[PDB]
Design an enzyme around this catalytic site. Structure first.
Site, mmCIF file in Angstrom:
data_model
loop_
_atom_site.group_PDB
_atom_site.id
_atom_site.type_symbol
_atom_site.label_atom_id
_atom_site.label_comp_id
_atom_site.label_asym_id
_atom_site.label_seq_id
_atom_site.Cartn_x
_atom_site.Cartn_y
_atom_site.Cartn_z
ATOM 1 N N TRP A 188 -1.577 -4.362 -1.246
ATOM 2 C CA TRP A 188 -2.071 -2.996 -1.294
ATOM 3 C C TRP A 188 -2.996 -2.758 -0.103
ATOM 4 O O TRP A 188 -3.964 -3.512 0.074
ATOM 5 C CB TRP A 188 -2.802 -2.774 -2.614
ATOM 6 C CG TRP A 188 -3.181 -1.356 -2.895
ATOM 7 C CD1 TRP A 188 -2.396 -0.250 -2.752
ATOM 8 C CD2 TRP A 188 -4.440 -0.894 -3.395
ATOM 9 N NE1 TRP A 188 -3.092 0.874 -3.124
ATOM 10 C CE2 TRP A 188 -4.350 0.505 -3.524
ATOM 11 C CE3 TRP A 188 -5.636 -1.529 -3.743
ATOM 12 C CZ2 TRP A 188 -5.411 1.282 -3.982
ATOM 13 C CZ3 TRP A 188 -6.687 -0.757 -4.200
ATOM 14 C CH2 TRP A 188 -6.569 0.633 -4.314
ATOM 15 N N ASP B 50 -6.053 -8.638 -9.748
ATOM 16 C CA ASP B 50 -5.885 -7.189 -9.696
ATOM 17 C C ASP B 50 -4.759 -6.840 -10.664
ATOM 18 O O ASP B 50 -3.596 -7.176 -10.419
ATOM 19 C CB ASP B 50 -5.575 -6.728 -8.274
ATOM 20 C CG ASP B 50 -5.561 -5.220 -8.138
ATOM 21 O OD1 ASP B 50 -5.377 -4.528 -9.161
ATOM 22 O OD2 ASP B 50 -5.727 -4.725 -7.004
ATOM 23 N N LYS C 138 -2.277 4.005 -14.604
ATOM 24 C CA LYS C 138 -0.823 4.126 -14.599
ATOM 25 C C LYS C 138 -0.189 3.895 -15.965
ATOM 26 O O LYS C 138 0.670 4.680 -16.377
ATOM 27 C CB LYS C 138 -0.238 3.158 -13.565
ATOM 28 C CG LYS C 138 -0.540 3.598 -12.138
ATOM 29 C CD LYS C 138 -1.133 2.480 -11.305
ATOM 30 C CE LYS C 138 -1.954 3.025 -10.151
ATOM 31 N NZ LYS C 138 -1.111 3.639 -9.086
HETATM 32 C C1 LIG Z 1 -2.550 -3.257 -6.757
HETATM 33 C C2 LIG Z 1 -3.465 -2.101 -7.036
HETATM 34 N N1 LIG Z 1 -4.818 -2.324 -7.167
HETATM 35 C C3 LIG Z 1 -5.673 -1.275 -7.430
HETATM 36 C C4 LIG Z 1 -5.175 0.015 -7.567
HETATM 37 C C5 LIG Z 1 -6.144 1.144 -7.845
HETATM 38 O O1 LIG Z 1 -5.927 1.734 -9.106
HETATM 39 P P1 LIG Z 1 -6.822 3.012 -9.497
HETATM 40 O O2 LIG Z 1 -6.097 4.282 -9.128
HETATM 41 O O3 LIG Z 1 -7.068 2.981 -10.986
HETATM 42 O O4 LIG Z 1 -8.134 2.952 -8.748
HETATM 43 C C6 LIG Z 1 -3.810 0.250 -7.442
HETATM 44 C C7 LIG Z 1 -3.288 1.658 -7.398
HETATM 45 O O5 LIG Z 1 -2.168 1.859 -6.936
HETATM 46 C C8 LIG Z 1 -2.952 -0.816 -7.177
HETATM 47 O O6 LIG Z 1 -1.603 -0.609 -7.045
#
Ligand SMILES: Cc1ncc(COP(=O)(O)O)c(C=O)c1O
Ligand SMILES: *Cc1c(COP(=O)(O)O)cnc(C)c1O
Lengths: 399, 399
Positions: free
Chosen positions: B133, B214, B249
């Site tokens: 990410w 994560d 999500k």
């Molecule tokens: C791998 C990963 N970590 C963290 C996040 C962040 O999620 P949030 O929108 O709840 O901050 C995402 C969002 O796409 C993600 O895919």
């Protein structure tokens, strides 16, 4: 292998929150908590405003998605925030010199500004009033910024020591940040007069300071427009400044984390450049802001019917606090206080220094179940007609 | 005096959000957005879950105050989060080894952990998969931590290069942090097998790494419990670990910023000690977390009737994505792609590397209005039976 958390030192006790734990533990009936930091109505409750319930029902019926907001949040929330701060016909808005990011609370706005300044400017020093909100130092320190203190409170006359304020800021260099409370100074409730604001604004321009305004209590001193006079005096003379505002108190949206960081630069082209780096500091922090709380604010401020309701609820909160300030002084007198507490009437907002020593504060808590912060700060909004007499009887007993 | 903001450089475009802004501005009617990681139903909408709407209705009719939550958030939220992560009768839970703070989203959980580590420990480096990410590097850099990359993806065979993974991680020293995706690896969609997870769990304890998980897509690979097997393998073997999780999500609660940072230490005394410093890092950031989103999640997970609805809504989301992966592969062959895209069937979650080059991704956007990330990552959850044919015709056109 040795653990990574092995030699971590326990963090100290938060002043405001450390008291809440000691209070909830107290099993005595009739205990009074004046160390709170939120508003309470005539019955000791912190209700949801009617305008907020209305706005929330409208959102429940009309929201079709929870899709992400932009990094800077709901656009209408930003526009309405700038109108509240600078006025409907402000030149800062017409000249497109201001950019606003929706943030999680006023704290989030201060942190975003701190990270933005630390990473993108030569600012190394932030000047904060002594006393001030204890969390100011933690927020700017979290970004590695040195925090110096300037004099503010004249504890003899319970007034603003303006002469010492000027002298203590003599060593504040150009490019340093100087933090001002927009209104209802926390914890003293002592605000500069319009003439004093103007003097500080002019001096700030000559010295080259970057003013940062913390605006958490707009509408709790005199009124929405009146409480912004000091900021707008700075806005009229400065090319650059930062405003961290909060809607936690004047909308009763504490736990929804509704705030704004507003960036002002010399021209539209410069603020947009800077704001892109502010959005980058937000992206690497919480990504994008929470919608529900800010949607409520935006709904209320964009609907004339709901706004009229909210403004009256804010007046009700402001007027109740002033009544408790007056009732507090009269009841202390009624209960035999010889010390003069008239200064309470002259101070603005929820907070004031009672002038009690830590030793007297300690006696109130363990001997009478009355809980105040060790600095002697008391939340006037925590006082009610039902608890005023016990409260005052206790104070008189330790003077 | 020269301005403090005058010499600021404009920020670069976000690899994901800069694309989204372009898509919103594109006026062509047949444009398709396969960039941002947001779920779409069979009709191309991102609706509010029915369970969420019901929980929000309950909150609207029963909430009596917006008073601040604690620094760590709603207790039941924390308790329910640990059960999803570790299981109903987890030893970590019964041994009181885990502490959870409600955070503004998964991103907020990452920054809180990073701030906590950089300011209370000797951690200097964080190890993140290559690719990963994009915001991972920005979060840890902004906290002052160095970010090193370890191999992960075999681009030739479209699989996990478990050999290069173990090799590059042998340069990671004890006390370093190694970030793992719990499931549905972003952007590759390739997750380690349980045998590979257990191999990493054993290698981790030997070399002294600090695992950071994560967990943004629990329930999107195979199921709620199944997707936690990798983490629960580390949990049954490690003394310390950190889990940043998101409900954005699997609850469709994106813009309400609902996440958790869960801290695990050797015993209950160490975790409470370290957690006190985590609460300090939160206080200096956003003070306390937003209530609405987390309250919804806690209301649902604590009510068997609501939870039953939510678990079925999550299953439908998971299954629809799998149907689109099949349909996507079948349709590419129908439209004359020739190349073998079967590996897409073996990938989990929303995301998959299409294998397209940055130049092909660019053509898809400019010539066909199909918007994917420059890395070739496409959001399968953005594909519907209606947009599948134009989408696949555009891809075959640039091959
Ligand atoms: C791998 C990963 N970590 C963290 C996040 C962040 O999620 P949030 O929108 O709840 O901050 C995402 C969002 O796409 C993600 O895919
Ligand atoms: C309450 C307060 C804040 C923070 O407000 P939140 O919206 O709760 O984050 C900032 N500055 C001052 C002076 C405050 O009193």
């Amino acid at each position: 292998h040795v653990g990574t958390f092995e030699n971590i030192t326990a963090a100290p006790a938060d002043p405001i929150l450390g008291l809440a734990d000691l209070f909830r533990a107290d099993e005595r009936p009739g205990k009074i908590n004046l160390g709170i930091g939120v508003y309470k109505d005539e019955t000791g409750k912190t209700p949801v405003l009617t305008s907020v319930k209305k706005a929330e029902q409208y959102l429940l019926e009309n929201e079709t998605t929870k899709n992400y907001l932009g990094i800077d949040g709901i656009p209408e929330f930003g526009r309405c925030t700038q109108e509240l701060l600078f006025g409907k016909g402000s030149a800062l808005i017409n000249d497109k010199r201001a950019r606003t990011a929706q943030t999680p609370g006023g704290t989030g706005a201060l942190r975003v500004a701190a990270d933005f300044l630390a990473k993108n400017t030569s600012v190394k020093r932030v000047w904060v009033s002594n006393p001030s909100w204890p969390n100011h130092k933690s927020v700017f320190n979290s970004a590695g910024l040195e925090v110096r203190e300037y004099a503010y409170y004249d504890a003899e006359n319970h007034t603003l020591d303006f002469d010492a304020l000027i002298n203590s800021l003599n060593e504040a260099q150009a490019g340093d940040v100087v933090l001002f409370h927009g209104c209802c100074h926390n914890p003293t409730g002592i605000d500069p007069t319009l003439e004093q604001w103007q003097t500080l604004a002019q001096l700030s321009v000559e010295k080259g300071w970057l003013p940062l305004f913390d605006f958490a209590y707009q509408g709790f001193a005199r009124g929405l427009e009146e409480d912004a006079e000091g900021l707008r005096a700075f806005a009229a003379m400065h090319k650059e400044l930062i405003v961290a505002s909060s809607y936690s108190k004047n909308f009763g949206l504490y736990n929804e984390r509704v705030g704004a960081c507003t960036l002002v630069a010399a021209d539209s082209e410069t603020v947009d450049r800077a704001f892109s780096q502010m959005k980058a500091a937000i992206r690497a922090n919480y990504s994008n802001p929470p919608a529900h709380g800010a949607s409520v604010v935006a709904t209320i401020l964009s609907n004339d019917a709901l706004r009229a309701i909210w403004e009256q609820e804010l007046t009700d909160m402001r007027q109740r606090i002033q009544r408790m300030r007056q009732l507090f002084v009269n009841t202390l007198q009624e209960k035999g206080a010889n010390r003069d507490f008239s200064f309470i009437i002259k101070q603005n907002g929820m907070f004031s220094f009672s002038g009690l020593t830590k030793e007297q504060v300690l006696r109130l808590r363990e001997e009478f179940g009355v809980y105040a912060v060790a600095s002697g700060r008391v939340n006037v909004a925590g006082m009610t007609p039902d608890n005023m007499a016990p409260l005052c009887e206790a104070i008189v007993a330790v003077l």
